[PDB]
DNA sequence: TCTTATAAATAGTT
DNA sequence: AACTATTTATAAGA
């Protein structure tokens, strides 16, 4: 960007909406690339601050959810907490 | 209860 | 990267796994950032080539899934086809 | 929406 | 596992 931003809630409503649309596209594009490069099936669910639902699926959202339900447990499960932790470890 | 959530998700999508 | 790559399947099993781990982290990190910056709840489901499930949730995967079922209709719905089309319009 | 300067991710060596 | 040149993403401007 023109400036480094801190990873912290954006307060200006309009800045938030603009960042949201941009980074959402950027998130989906990364997912697209991963799914092709590495032969992954991906589903992504986003609820924005107003609880609008946005979704992406490499090929089929329904197939992937149905698959998820047939698997008893995830081979890996991460949350924001875990991501923060990895970053701390990764250092600079 | 992940098994409940999975079963509710299952029924939703299927219906 | 040191060179541009095409968006195509990686055939070298080792290159694939290495890219897979790097990019998976990258994607989750973007999701983390988005969830905090714009106050959002996010769930990610990934099945790799070997059909091993990896998942991420800003806060709670179960809650996100539970919420999903209460919407009859996604407010926006994209697939690879959609992303491929958007990129076309921009080279 | 676009442009762009700049920050951030990553492909290829190491 | 490291590093870094290079590609990609994006914040701020317009």
Chain B residue at shortest CA distance from A68: B6
Cα dihedral across residues A18, A21, A24, A29: positive or negative: negative
**Can you tell me the distance from the alpha carbon of C31 to that of A67, in angstroms, rounded to the nearest whole number?**
22
Cα distances from C69 to residues A2, A28, A65, in angstroms, run: 40, 21, 11
Q: H helices of chain A, where?
A: 13-37, 61-70, 80-90
Residue whose C-alpha is closest to residue C29's, from A31, A73, A49: A31
Give chain A's end-to-end CA distance (angstroms, integer): 19
Decide the pairing of beta strands A53-57 and A41-47. Answer: antiparallel
Chain A residue at shortest CA distance from B15: A62
**Can you tell me the distance from the alpha carbon of C16 to that of C49, in angstroms, rounded to the nearest whole number?**
9
C13-88 is a CATH 3.40.1810.10 domain: yes
Burial C75-89 (b: 16+ CB within 10 A, else e): eeebbbeebeeeeee
Q: Domain ranges in chain A?
A: 13-90
**Can you tell me the distance from the alpha carbon of A12 to that of C59, in angstroms, rounded to the nearest whole number?**
23
- CB contacts of C65 in chain B (<8 Å) are 5-6, 9
A36 by Cβ neighbours in 10 Å (0-12 / 13-18 / 19+) ranks as middle
Alpha-carbon distance C27 to nearest alpha carbon in chain A (angstroms) = 6
Alpha-carbon distance A33 to nearest alpha carbon in chain C (angstroms) = 6
Collect all residues with Cβ–Cβ distance below 8 Å to B6 and sequence separation of at least 6: A68, A69, C65
Query: Quick check: A23 and C37 CB within 8 A?
Result: yes
CATH annotation of A13-90: 3.40.1810.10
Resolution (A): 2.4
Number of alpha carbons in the 13 Å side-chain half-sphere of residue A45: 27
Please give the method by which this entry was determined. X-ray
CB A34 within 8 A of CB C22: no
For the beta carbon of residue C20, count every other beta carbon within 10 angstroms.
20
CB A78 within 8 A of CB C28: yes
């Amino acid at each position: 960007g023109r400036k480094k931003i801190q990873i912290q809630r954006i307060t200006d409503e309009r800045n938030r909406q603009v960042t949201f649309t941009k980074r959402k596209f950027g998130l989906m594009k990364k997912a697209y690339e991963l799914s092709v490069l590495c032969d992954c099936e991906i589903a992504l669910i986003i609820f924005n601050h107003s609880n609008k639902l946005f979704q992406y699926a490499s090929t089929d959202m329904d197939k992937v959810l149905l698959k998820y339900t047939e698997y008893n447990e995830p081979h890996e499960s991460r949350t924001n907490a875990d991501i923060i932790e990895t970053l701390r470890k990764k250092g600079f | 209860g992940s098994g409940e959530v999975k079963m509710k998700l299952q029924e939703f999508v299927l219906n």
